[PDB]
């Protein structure tokens, strides 16, 4: 199935398909955390795991969600050096938009152009195509809520559920099975959807220092990232 | 820019490109060459017409200016570039002091060339072997004979290519001062010499000569068949 | 220390074991264990790697265990490893397994010559042209002590050479063997006495009875010049 | 930094040139498309299909509009797609810049074509790993062409292209002529995809378009499902 | 081995094999000694000669009035690094009009020096660079090596076979503080002659001498007045 | 680096080239191009391949591309080294027209692509082309010419010639039939036609599956055609029955 | 199973700087001889074919009016280093108008050998370090000098040099024949000894050439008439 | 180690190291007898060897240092 | 065989090898230990004096990177003097470019984005180094981070890097540093260095000390000679 260097660099094998890029796919996976993403109504929602092994660590600086721009939000899976290169450069991305064009940039063309960038990294053969997930959330006129991921092969696409991470596959299918049913979703439903499904998948029944949360909606566009009180009060509320 | 060593040096202190290149110089045409009192000769052989050739787009013999000519022995590609090269640098040379080019001149020239282009990064040595006869200022004939390698040399008479050490050995044991007194006997030699051991049976000759007073002139296939003749009668009456 | 046993006894040294002869094709290995085994007065055991690559899985050890023990019958004798670079080179397992049964023969070897109650009054020696493809385990002191290495003749090699394989010559007053070392910078003593034998063929080839010394110059300039297309040396002289 | 700057296509001593295989190989593995020429205009249709419901089928497109009168759809890899697609608007805004009228088809297809051949020939990189099928209308006649990794391009009448294309020539072997309308060979398009299709063919499973002597446009989702309706 | 044909490439044990190479070829080298006393800096060196036709290779260079090194290794490298030092000295000399202190001649060195060991198809420089000087912190002796790193001694002494030298030097390292020259002088040489063997010690033509000092400048002498420092030298013990 | 390196501008122990050798062998298939002349005008046939029953038939040539005013070529090989060339010395010709105001012989743009052919066998190390192409043209210096190209990088004057799949058979009996100064524009199309029916097995030389051009010279025009397929079926029907009539004789 | 230009072996030597050293092996032995009163360069010419014109090969030739210089080894390669000396003495001159010495002759064409590599810059050199050694011979304001100068960049000062392929046996016969109270006419008398031992072929006016430098005249190459009365007395 | 293949395999020697591997631990525990193993090459073993019930410590040697070298002379 | 030969290559399972061995390499370093008290940080580092030849205070591993910025080093030296070259010149290109002094928070990413340059292209090695950086300020308070050479950079309340880590921070463990001025907490970090390196390893070893935090007002600098001695004082009562 190997003929020559096409197991080593980013060139076609015999069956048609590079081995290289499929690595990364594998390389995700070392980390070993999990993301969901949720759209709602009027609203989208991020919900993370985090895990401080020790406490000697300083606990206030293992985020791993990040703040592009005032109406933009991101979440990153994988590596972590790659992910906070590529948070530099979408940033750097953004700013450029901004000043050239006069208007903010939509979250649909920031991802096109970030699949764009990483899109040469399997072209060409001298180098390592960043082996790291991307997932964006936004508001925008005249649709409502986004949320896109991206991966490293240079593919990208809108969604209205995802999972990145260890436990795609069983996270999925019970987002599928829960979109299934057609029901209007508003911002306590959607927090509680999110915090259930990773909840349930785990099997862990996490306190409210384990998790991240990160919101927007149509009252304040601007991204902010929940505290533990308001955490607690949803993690309450959803047992009853 | 490609920038790869391509010649190195082997184990045993050696350079095995060269030596590949000097291979492919001896899978090549013959071509031989003398000089004379007052006119030098040079010829090639292995001619292999097909009956559907142009014989003026084939030619193996040049003339780089007024007084200077060559022929060449191995890759035909390589060949053009050295005769443009040296045109040029011949046409350039009258520039500067008016003086016609002398041999020595553009002998030393296309072997530095040769020479230097072994040691630039990321190129492959020339395939091709030179000889070039000329009559310089103050009527003094003479050739040279060029290497891929980057040495060249002054001889009497020579013959490379594909079978040359047969029609060395020949020469050898026949130049004279009295074969070289007579201008048509000069020709008769190598003529003979040029159907010792390459058969070249009359029809496979171009031969050329210049006599120290005008341009090259090569000369049709019709007197050659004269020269072949004579020398067959002169081998049969000779005993 | 067979032939003198009682100063290295009274002086309380225990003298080395084995020894391994590496050089390039033709300079002279086999020749020596020849002379040894002539010179020698005990057993001579003779074996060839490519005699231990049985059918069946589990011969090789047998077979080395066999020779040991045959070998420990005796009071005290010698055993000879013929181009041990055939019966392993160095453990590599990756994927399918491949190229192991021969390494256990090896490790059997191995496992013979050390660990309790080593094999006692033995001595082997062996012989390999290409030495940068044996296993770290086996060049250890303890069973490799001794290094001899065998180089291509500088100078006055050559001409003891050409003295030592020509005097049964029928050759005239005046030849120089000087000139004929000087002719011939880097070769080995199978071209020499194959120089030797070319200049005597063409002194017999047309009549007559005693070679000249043109008859050797030829002989050179056809035996060393022209085939020096083939030659063997370059690509060994860096063991690979 | 620095590249490579060395050829990683070679000669075989067979005198075949093996990734442009490798590369054919690989494109003929993607998604079916079909496109068919019938004396009014040119249909491009492709079948486009999502994972599971969480994919939102209005986000990307597999038929893209160059100019107002020019068309393409591809097929192969997915990435690979948008770079060519970008290049070729950039080509046609040069010519349209120079010569202030719009680009023949013919001279987009040459100037793609030739960048797919010289992205071939340079120092540490791949082939391309698509095909594409261009359609144009420009001075009453239409016209339709398709491209190839190698950078060769032919012009057709009818093409499949894709999984299970040789089935797909041999469908359009039986039934095209050229005598039809621009709705006839609609409907048999979608026939002749519908051979390849899952067990069900809703609309949002076909992407559709059209390029005739007004211009050059995608169906909307609508116009798609109803014409899916008296057929099959 | 496959680990062992570029500086790029990370053995599994966390080593580079042509950074070690090189340090092994540095060894070649003659052997050579440095020291300093309260105020002054000497360094002594051994020469060696190909053949009894042909004149001894020199050690001690002159890279400024109050700077000199000592080399061991392969000339050409030597050669181009004792360029840099004397450019940078006289760059230094001309802008800010002052002597140029030895800790930042060291510090460049070893940066220069640093840079051929990460990058693609290079390799370190083969030289054993023992420097000595005179500054406002009184006297200082360096080493350098292929690795590009540097240390900072009180006394030294490299080349082929010199750990005979390092022992004594190490065993005789408590009096070096307060005597002058003519015993300082002595003491190097005696360290010297340690790594010889029994047959020929300092025939006065295989020995250089460098000082350098408070109120004298880097001066450096050879087999001609080199006499002065060897009458006296005690009888080698056997 | 210079591990995925193939060195593919070196020698071998032989003395040879492989890569060079390669490509040659590459253009032992895909097609069979022939031409002769002996008179005023010269003529080119080759064979089609792309011969699909779905096709647009475009461009009014598949082949045969226009160079000058007063050239024509052929080629054989990759098609897209083919446009990158012809691409290429179209521009040559107009500049030497630009400089010298005057149309350039068919030697010195010939010796120019071969020296820009050559210059990727020497230095650079990329792939080489793998294109053997054709000339004719008309001069002033030398009236009509015809000339073959090589991947290597040399070339040669010629009078009948084919550098297609067959060649060796086409050549045999080129030579065994061809007379000098003496075949006008009327028998060498019968030549043609015979040569086309022996090397091509697939029997009665269907009309769509040859392309024939010819070139003549007027007063001052210099006409290149390429005549219709309305003109080839009456040769081929000549042919046949000349041939039949000289098989009833034997 | 491919190397890099400059990498190092575990013993530390190096692997193309070795080859060149001995890559030298095989080319025509010559002489130098340092004497108080002047010095002498010999070398043979190792005629092939009697076709040939001996006067043709040249192995001595002149970088100033005071300096001549001897090559072994190849000779494609030897023509750089000499033309970059007689560049740089005439740059010399023209700058400090006086006449430079040979050590520095000898010290910026040995500046120059190390410079082999494949990263750096286009003008470059393949891998090849120039292949050739060379004797330098000269008088300066501080007297006659001879140096010998070798493919790895290190330069020496002989008293009596011998390279080419007789290396060794010519210099073990120098080594009883040298003393400093040694005159021009016995230098090149036992010179000429040497390589009438040395040589494969009969010695005679055509098959080697020699040359000669004294504090008083110039560079000064010995002619076919001059070199026939210095052979009989042998 | 294991490996899954279809074309060819080495299967015997696998089946006497699960032996092996079923006796320590395994159905039937034992108490009265202790095993040492020596190697010099461990990343090509196999897993279930190195587990913490079947081979409980694991004991590394380490290249002697100036001190030991001079006491082992 | 062969993926583990360059750093542009992933791995089957997914993991680039040559940044693991760059990371081996670091493992063999003596040790450096960093605390950050109520009002400023503590450095530590044990040295190994390889012989009596080298002066006292030889191969600093205690550098200044700013006016008001430590630094400490573990690994390779070459690579630590570049990484503090290149810190430097950042520093001061910030500084001057603004016009005021450059918080860690950013340096920090600076210098972790100029390491992580190396570890995508073939052309060059991954650093062989991991250091930590540590300042006060009087706005910001204490700062800590630790980078290692794959390029992660994290906030931290007390570190320790090289050999003995592990055995270092299960004693930085039962320390209190949230509350205690760092007035004596010098005693802490030499009692907590005397109790690691047991003497078999090595025969003897020197202590180095840093300071910087409110008692220096901002400006980081050596201990004085007098509370280092103070320290070794109170750390010498080990034995009991
Ligand atoms: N020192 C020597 N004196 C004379 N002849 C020698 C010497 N060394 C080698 N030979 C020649 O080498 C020939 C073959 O040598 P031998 O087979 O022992 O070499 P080797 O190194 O074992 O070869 P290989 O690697 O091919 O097995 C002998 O016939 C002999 O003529
Ligand atoms: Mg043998």
Same mark, same amino acid.
């Given at each position: ?11 076609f ?17 070392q ?6 993403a949720?759209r709602?109504?009027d ?7 985090k895990?401080?092994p ?18 933009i ?7 972590t050096?790659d992910?906070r ?38 072209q ?15 508001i925008d006129?005249?649709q ?25 596959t069983?996270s ?6 829960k ?8 911002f ?14 785990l ?7 384990e998790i991240?949360?990160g919101v927007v909606?149509?009252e ?12 607690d ?8 | ?20 290149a000097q291979?492919?110089v ?22 292999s017409?097909?009956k ?11 003339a780089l ?6 022929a060449?022995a ?9 005769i ?13 002091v008016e003086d ?13 060339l ?15 072997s ?7 200022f103050?009527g003094?004939?003479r ?16 013959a ?7 029609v ?19 020709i ?8 010792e ?7 496979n000759?171009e ?28 081998k049969?009456?000779?005993? | 220390?067979?032939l003198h046993?009682?100063?290295?006894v009274?002086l ?10 590496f050089?390039?094709?033709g300079?002279?290995?086999t020749?020596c264990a020849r ?5 020698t ?9 490519s005699?231990?690559?049985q ?9 080395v265990r ?11 004798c010698?055993?000879f ?7 392993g080179?160095?453990?590599?397992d990756?994927?399918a397994?491949?190229?192991?049964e021969?390494?256990?023969t090896?490790?059997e070897?191995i ?19 290409r030495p940068?493809?044996?296993?770290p385990?086996?060049?250890r002191?303890?069973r490799?002590?001794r ?8 100078l006055?090699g ?13 050759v ?8 004929l ?10 071209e ?14 047309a009549?007559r ?6 008859d ?25 | 930094?620095?590249?490579?700057s ?8 067979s005198?075949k ?10 494109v ?13 205009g ?11 419901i969480?994919?939102?089928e ?6 893209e ?6 068309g393409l ?6 990435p ?6 970008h ?14 009228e ?8 040459q ?8 992205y ?19 001075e009453g ?9 190698s950078?060769?391009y ?6 499949a ?9 041999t ?11 621009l709705?006839?060979?609609?409907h048999?398009?979608i ?6 299709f899952?067990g069900?063919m ?31 | ?8 490439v990370w053995?599994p044990?966390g080593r580079?094999?042509?950074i070690?190479?090189?340090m092994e ?9 440095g ?42 490298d ?9 450019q ?21 060195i070893?940066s ?26 009184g006297?200082h002796?360096?080493?350098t090596c292929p ?10 002494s490299?080349?082929?076979?010199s750990?005979?030298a390092?022992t ?13 020259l ?25 020995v250089?001498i460098?000082?350098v ?6 001066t450096?002498?050879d ?14 013990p056997? | 680096?210079?591990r ?6 070196i ?27 002996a008179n005023d ?9 792309n011969?699909?029953?779905?096709l647009?038939?475009?461009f ?15 080629v ?28 350039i ?37 030398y ?20 550098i297609?799949?067959?060649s060796?058979?086409a ?9 000098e100064?003496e075949?006008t ?12 029916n ?14 024939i ?14 005549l219709?397929?309305k ?12 041939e039949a ?6 | ?6 990498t ?9 700087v070795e080859?060149? $050293? *001995?890559? %030298? ?5 010559? !002489? &130098?001889?340092?004497? #108080?009163?002047?010095?002498?360069? =010999? ?10 014109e001996?006067?043709? $090969? *040249?192995? %001595?030739?002149?970088?100033?009016a005071? !300096? &001549?210089?001897?090559? #072994?080894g190849?000779?494609?390669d =030897? ?9 740089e ?7 400090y ?9 000898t010290?910026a064409?040995?500046?120059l050998?190390?410079?082999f590599?494949?990263?750096d ?22 007297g ?5 100068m ?5 330069f ?13 046996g010519?210099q073990?016969?120098?080594?009883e ?13 036992s ?5 009438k031992?040395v040589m ?7 098959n ?15 002619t ?9 007395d042998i | ?24 631990d ?11 193993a020596?190697?010099?090459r ?7 060897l190195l587990?913490?019930?079947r081979?409980?410590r ?5 290249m002697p240092n100036?001190?030991?070298?001079a006491?082992?002379? | 065989?062969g993926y ?12 680039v090898?040559?940044?693991e061995?760059?990371?081996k390499a670091?493992?063999?370093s ?6 950050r008290?109520?009002?400023?940080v ?7 004096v390889?012989?009596?030849?080298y ?6 591993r ?6 008001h910025?430590g ?5 390779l ?28 928070k ?13 570890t995508?292209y ?16 009087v706005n ?11 390029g992660?950079?994290?906030?931290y309340?007390?570190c320790?890097?090289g ?26 970090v ?12 090595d025969?003897?070893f ?6 910087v935090?409110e ?14 001695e ?5 750390a010498?009562?080990?034995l009991?």
């Open positions: 199935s190997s003929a020559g260097f096409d197991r080593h660099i980013t060139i094998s015999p069956e048609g398909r590079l081995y290289q890029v499929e690595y990364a796919f594998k390389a995700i996976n980390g070993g955390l999990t993301s969901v949720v709602g109504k609203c989208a929602v991020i919900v993370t795991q895990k401080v020790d406490k000697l660590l300083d606990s206030s600086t293992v985020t791993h969600l990040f703040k592009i721009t005032e109406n939000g991101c979440v990153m899976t994988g590596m050096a992910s290169s590529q948070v530099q450069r979408a940033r750097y991305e953004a700013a450029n938009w901004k000043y050239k064009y006069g208007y903010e940039i939509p979250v649909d063309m920031l991802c096109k152009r970030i699949a764009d960038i990483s899109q040469v990294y399997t060409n053969a001298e180098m390592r195509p960043l082996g790291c997930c991307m997932i964006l959330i936004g006129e005249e409502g809520p986004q949320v896109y991921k991206c991966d490293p092969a240079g593919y990208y696409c809108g969604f209205k559920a995802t999972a990145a991470g260890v436990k795609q069983e999925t299918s019970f987002l599928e099975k979109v299934k049913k057609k029901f209007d979703w508003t306590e439903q959607t927090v509680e959807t999110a915090i259930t499904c990773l909840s349930t998948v099997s862990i029944d996490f306190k409210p220092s991240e949360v909606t149509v304040n566009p601007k991204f902010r990232i929940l505290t533990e009180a308001e955490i009060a949803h993690l309450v509320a959803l047992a009853e | 820019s490609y920038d790869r060593a391509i010649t190195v040096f082997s184990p045993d202190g050696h350079l095995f490109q060269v030596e590949y291979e492919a001896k899978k090549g045409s013959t071509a031989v060459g003398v000089r004379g009192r007052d006119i030098v000769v040079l010829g090639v052989e292995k001619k017409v097909a559907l050739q142009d014989e003026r787009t084939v030619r193996k013999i040049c200016d007024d007084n200077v000519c060559m060449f191995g890759l035909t590609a390589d060949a053009r570039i050295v443009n090269r040296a045109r040029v640098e011949c046409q350039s040379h009258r520039l500067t016609p080019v002398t041999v020595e001149y553009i002998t030393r020239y296309i072997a530095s040769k020479q230097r282009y072994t040691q630039s990064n990321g190129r492959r040595p020339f395939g091709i030179a000889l070039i006869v000329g009559f310089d103050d003094t004939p050739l040279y004979q060029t290497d891929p390698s980057g040495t060249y040399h002054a001889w009497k008479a020579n490379i290519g594909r079978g040359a050490k047969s060395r050995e020949f020469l050898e044991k026949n130049y004279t001062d009295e074969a070289i007194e007579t201008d048509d006997l000069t008769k030699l190598v003529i003979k010499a040029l159907l051991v390459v058969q070249s049976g009359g029809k000759i031969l050329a000569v210049m006599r120290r007073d005008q341009s090259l002139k090569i000369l049709n296939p019709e007197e050659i068949e004269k020269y072949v003749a004579e020398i067959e009668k002169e049969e009456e000779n005993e | 220390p067979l046993p009682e100063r290295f009274n309380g040294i225990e003298p080395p074991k084995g020894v391994l002869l050089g390039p094709p300079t002279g290995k020749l002379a040894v085994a002539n010179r007065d005990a057993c001579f055991i003779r074996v060839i790697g005699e231990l690559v059918k069946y899985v589990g011969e090789g050890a047998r077979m066999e020779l040991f023990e045959m070998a420990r019958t005796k009071k005290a010698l055993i490893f013929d181009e041990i670079d055939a019966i080179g160095a453990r590599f990756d994927g397994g491949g190229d192991n021969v390494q256990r090896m490790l070897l496992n013979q010559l050390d660990g309790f109650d080593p094999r006692g009054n033995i001595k082997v020696l062996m012989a390999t042209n940068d493809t044996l296993d385990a086996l060049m002191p303890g490799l002590d290094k001899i290495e065998f180089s291509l003749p500088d006055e050559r001409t003891h050479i050409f003295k030592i394989h020509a005097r049964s010559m029928s005239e007053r005046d030849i120089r063997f000087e000139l070392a000087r002719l011939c910078p880097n070769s080995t003593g199978a020499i006495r194959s120089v030797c034998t070319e200049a005597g063929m063409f002194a017999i080839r009549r009875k005693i070679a000249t010394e043109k050797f110059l030829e002989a050179v300039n056809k035996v060393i010049k022209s085939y020096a297309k083939f030659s063997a040396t370059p690509r060994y002289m860096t063991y690979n | 930094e620095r590249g490579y060395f050829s990683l296509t070679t000669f075989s001593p005198g040139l093996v990734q442009i295989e490798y590369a054919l190989a690989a003929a593995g993607g998604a079916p498309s079909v496109g068919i020429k019938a004396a009014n040119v249909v491009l249709a492709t079948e486009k299909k999502q994972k599971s969480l994919y939102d209005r986000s990307v497109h597999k038929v509009p160059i100019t107002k009168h020019i759809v591809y097929s192969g890899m997915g690979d797609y948008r770079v060519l697609v290049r070729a608007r950039k080509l046609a805004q040069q010519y349209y810049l120079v010569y202030q719009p680009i023949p088809t013919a001279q987009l297809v100037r793609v074509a030739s960048v797919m051949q010289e071939t020939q340079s120092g540490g990189v791949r082939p391309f790993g698509v095909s594409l099928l261009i359609c144009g209308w420009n006649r239409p016209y339709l062409f398709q491209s190839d990794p950078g060769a032919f012009a057709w009448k009818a093409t292209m894709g999984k299970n294309y040789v089935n797909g020539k469908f359009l072997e039986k039934r095209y002529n050229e005598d039809l309308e709705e006839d060979a609609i048999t398009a026939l002749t995809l519908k051979e390849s899952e069900q809703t609309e949002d499973n076909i992407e559709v378009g059209i390029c005739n002597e007004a211009g050059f446009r995608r169906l909307t989702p609508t116009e798609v499902k109803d014409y899916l309706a008296a057929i099959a | 081995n496959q680990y062992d044909n570029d500086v790029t053995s044990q580079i094999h042509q070690e190479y090189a070829a540095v060894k070649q080298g003659s052997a050579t000694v020291l300093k006393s309260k105020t002054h800096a000497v360094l002594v060196a051994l020469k060696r000669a190909q053949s009894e036709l042909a004149a001894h290779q020199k050690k001690i260079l002159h890279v400024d009035n109050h700077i000199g090194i000592s080399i061991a290794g392969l000339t050409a030597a050669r181009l690094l004792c360029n840099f030092m004397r940078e000295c006289l760059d230094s000399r001309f802008v800010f009009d002052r002597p140029l202190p030895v800790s930042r001649l060291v510090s460049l070893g220069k020096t640093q840079i051929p060991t990460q990058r693609y198809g290079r390799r370190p420089y083969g030289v054993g660079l023992l420097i000595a000087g005179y500054d406002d912190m006297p002796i360096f080493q690795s590009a790193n540097y240390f900072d001694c009180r006394a030294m490299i080349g082929a076979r750990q005979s390092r004594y030097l190490e065993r005789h390292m408590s009096e070096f503080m307060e005597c002058n003519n015993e300082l002088v002595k003491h190097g040489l005696r360290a010297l002659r340690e790594t010889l063997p029994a047959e020929q010690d300092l025939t006065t033509k295989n250089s460098g000082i000092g408070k109120d004298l400048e880097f450096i002498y087999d001609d007045d080199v006499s002065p420092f060897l009458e006296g030298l005690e009888e080698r056997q | 680096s210079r995925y390196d193939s060195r593919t501008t020698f071998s122990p032989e003395g040879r080239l492989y890569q060079v050798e390669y490509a040659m062998e590459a253009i032992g298939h895909a097609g069979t191009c022939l031409g002769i002349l005008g010269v003529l080119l046939a080759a064979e089609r391949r011969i699909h029953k779905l647009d038939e475009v009014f040539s598949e082949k045969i591309y226009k160079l000058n005013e007063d050239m024509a070529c052929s054989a090989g990759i098609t897209s080294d083919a446009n990158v060339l012809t691409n290429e010395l179209r521009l040559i010709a107009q500049r030497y027209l630009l400089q010298y105001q005057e149309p012989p068919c030697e010195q743009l010939v010796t120019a692509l071969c020296d820009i052919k050559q210059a990727y066998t020497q230095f650079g190390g990329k792939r080489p082309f793998g294109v053997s192409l054709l000339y004719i043209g008309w001069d002033k210096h009236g009509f010419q015809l000339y073959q190209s090589d991947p290597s990088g040399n070339y040669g004057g010629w009078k009948a010639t084919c297609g799949n067959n060796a058979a050549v045999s009996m080129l030579k065994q039939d061809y007379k100064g075949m524009l009327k028998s060498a199309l019968a030549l043609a036609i015979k040569v086309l022996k090397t091509m097995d697939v029997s009665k030389l269907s009309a769509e599956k040859v392309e051009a010819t070139l003549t010279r007027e007063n001052g025009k210099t006409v290149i055609r390429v219709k397929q003109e080839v079926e009456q040769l081929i029907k000549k042919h046949e029955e000349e009539k000289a098989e009833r004789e034997k | 199973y491919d190397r890099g230009v400059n190092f072996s575990p013993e530390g030597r190096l692997f193309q080859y060149a $050293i *001995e890559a %030298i092996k095989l080319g025509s032995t010559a !002489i &130098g001889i340092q004497t #108080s009163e002047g010095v002498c360069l =010999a070398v043979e010419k190792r005629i092939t074919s009697p076709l040939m001996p006067s043709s $090969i *040249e192995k %001595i030739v002149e970088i100033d005071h !300096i &001549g210089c001897a090559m #072994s190849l000779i494609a =030897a023509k750089t280093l000499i033309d970059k000396a007689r560049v003495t005439q740059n010399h001159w023209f700058t108008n006086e006449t430079m010495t040979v050590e520095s002759v010290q064409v040995s500046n050998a190390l410079q590599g494949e990263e810059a286009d003008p470059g050199a393949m891998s090849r370090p120039f292949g050739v050694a060379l004797l330098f011979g000269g008088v300066d304001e501080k006659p000098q001879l140096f010998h070798d493919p790895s960049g290190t020496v000062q002989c008293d009596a040099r011998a390279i080419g392929s007789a290396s060794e010519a073990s016969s120098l080594q024949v040298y003393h400093k109270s040694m005159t021009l006419k016995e230098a090149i008398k010179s000429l000894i040497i390589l031992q494969e072929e009969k010695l005679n006016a055509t080697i050439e020699l040359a000669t430098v004294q504090p008083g005249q110039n560079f000064h190459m010995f076919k008439e001059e070199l026939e009365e210095v052979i009989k | 180690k294991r490996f899954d293949s279809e074309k060819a395999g080495d299967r015997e020697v696998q089946r006497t190291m699960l032996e092996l591997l079923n006796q320590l395994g159905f039937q525990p034992n108490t009265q007898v202790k095993v040492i020596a190697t010099n461990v990343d090509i073993l196999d897993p279930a587990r913490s019930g081979l409980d694991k004991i590394e040697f380490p100036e001190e030991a070298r006491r082992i002379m | 065989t583990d030969l360059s750093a542009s290559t992933f791995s089957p399972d997914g993991r090898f040559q940044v061995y760059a990371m670091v493992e063999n003596s040790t450096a230990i960093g605390i008290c109520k009002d400023g503590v450095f530590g580092v044990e040295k190994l390889l012989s009596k030849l002066e006292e205070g030889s191969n600093k205690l550098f200044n990177v700013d006016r910025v630094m400490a080093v573990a690994g030296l070459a690579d630590a003097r570049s990484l503090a070259d290149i810190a430097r010149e950042e520093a001061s290109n910030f500084r001057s470019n603004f016009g005021y002094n450059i918080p860690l950013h340096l920090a990413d600076r210098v972790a984005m100029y390491v992580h340059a190396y995508l073939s052309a060059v090695r991954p650093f062989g180094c991991s250091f930590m950086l540590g300042s006060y300020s910001d308070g204490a700062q800590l981070y630790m980078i290692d050479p794959s992660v950079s994290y906030g309340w007390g320790a890097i050999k003995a880590r592990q055995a270092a921070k299960t004693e930085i463990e039962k320390l209190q540093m949230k509350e205690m001025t760092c007035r004596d907490i010098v005693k802490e030499a009692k907590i260095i005397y109790i690691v390196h047991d003497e078999v390893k025969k003897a020197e202590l180095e000390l840093s300071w935090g008692l220096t007002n901002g400006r980081h600098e050596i201990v004085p000679k007098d509370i280092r103070e320290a070794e004082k109170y010498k009562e080990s009991k």
